[PDB]
């Protein structure tokens, strides 16, 4: 395991993650390059702050479900390559209706460079601690639509509120949100900005 990085599962004890990119259940239809393990990897500092966010279980009984943490540069390249492929309509309906695969790298859904490769960015949700179900956010992970924006409309009051709560828990835990994606958070004072890693998640 790379230095300054750890498997977050051993730090965030009772977490029920699902490494989306380590399974065929993502927008590309199959595990992205560099993902040979269904585990979330991350920087010790990310784990530390995630622990603080998860301890905000004090909020409205929420649990966190992690989807993606550190993402290898090659995974980002894999995304870019995928965006450049002809439309097979395999994941369109679920991940990007309303947008075309042509404009993926212009509307800015799949950039050439990801904060994830720095190891301090995380994708997550919150599940009800009391009921166990997933807190409704109005759009799915990797929705790639204006619907996924924090400030989005067309989302119910509960869904918008829910996003606000996720954000609040993250911001109060050392993270910075991102307006275009309610699920995206980056550690505010990350250990390796400028550093885009490429070791595999395994």
Question: Residues with catalytic annotation?
Answer: 181
Name which of 118 and 162 has its Cβ closer to a second copy.
162
Q: Which of residues 105-134 bind a second copy (CB under 8 A)?
A: 127, 132-134
Q: Which of these, 34, 108, 26, lies nearest to 71 by C-alpha position?
A: 34
142 binds a second copy per the rule CB under 8 A: no
15 binds a second copy per the rule CB under 8 A: yes
24 binds a second copy per the rule CB under 8 A: yes
Q: How far is the CB of 66 from a second copy (least distance, A)?
A: 9
Number of neighbouring beta carbons within 10 Å of residue 195: 13
Q: Which of residues 69-108 bind a second copy (CB under 8 A)?
A: none
Handedness of CA 180, 183, 189, 190 (dihedral sign): negative
Question: Which residues make beta-bridge pairs with 126?
Answer: 64
Biggest distance spanned by C-alpha atoms of the chain: 46
Q: Two tokens at 129?
A: 């601690």
Interface segment toward a second copy; rule CB under 8 A; list 23-31, 53-61, 113-121, 172-180: 23-31
């Amino acid at each position: 395991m790379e230095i300054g990085f750890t498997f977050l599962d051993e730090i965030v004890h009772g977490v029920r993650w699902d490494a989306k990119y380590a399974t065929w259940d993502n927008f590309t239809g199959k595990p992205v390059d560099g993902y040979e393990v269904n585990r979330i990897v991350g920087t010790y500092e990310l784990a530390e702050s995630l622990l603080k966010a998860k301890e905000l279980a004090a909020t409205q009984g929420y649990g966190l479900l992690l989807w993606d943490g550190y993402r290898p540069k090659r995974a980002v390249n894999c995304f870019m390559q995928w965006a450049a492929q002809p439309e097979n309509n395999l994941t369109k309906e679920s991940y990007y209706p309303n947008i075309d695969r042509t404009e993926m790298i212009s509307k800015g859904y799949v950039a050439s460079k990801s904060s994830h490769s720095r190891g301090s960015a995380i994708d997550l949700t919150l599940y009800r601690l009391d009921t166990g179900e997933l807190v409704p956010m109005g759009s799915r992970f990797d929705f790639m639509d204006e619907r996924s924006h924090h400030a989005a409309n067309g989302i119910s009051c509960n869904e918008a509120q829910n996003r606000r709560r996720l954000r609040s828990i993250m911001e109060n835990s050392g993270f910075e949100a991102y307006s275009l994606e309610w699920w995206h958070y980056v550690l505010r004072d990350e250990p390796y900005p400028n550093s885009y890693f490429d070791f595999p998640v395994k």
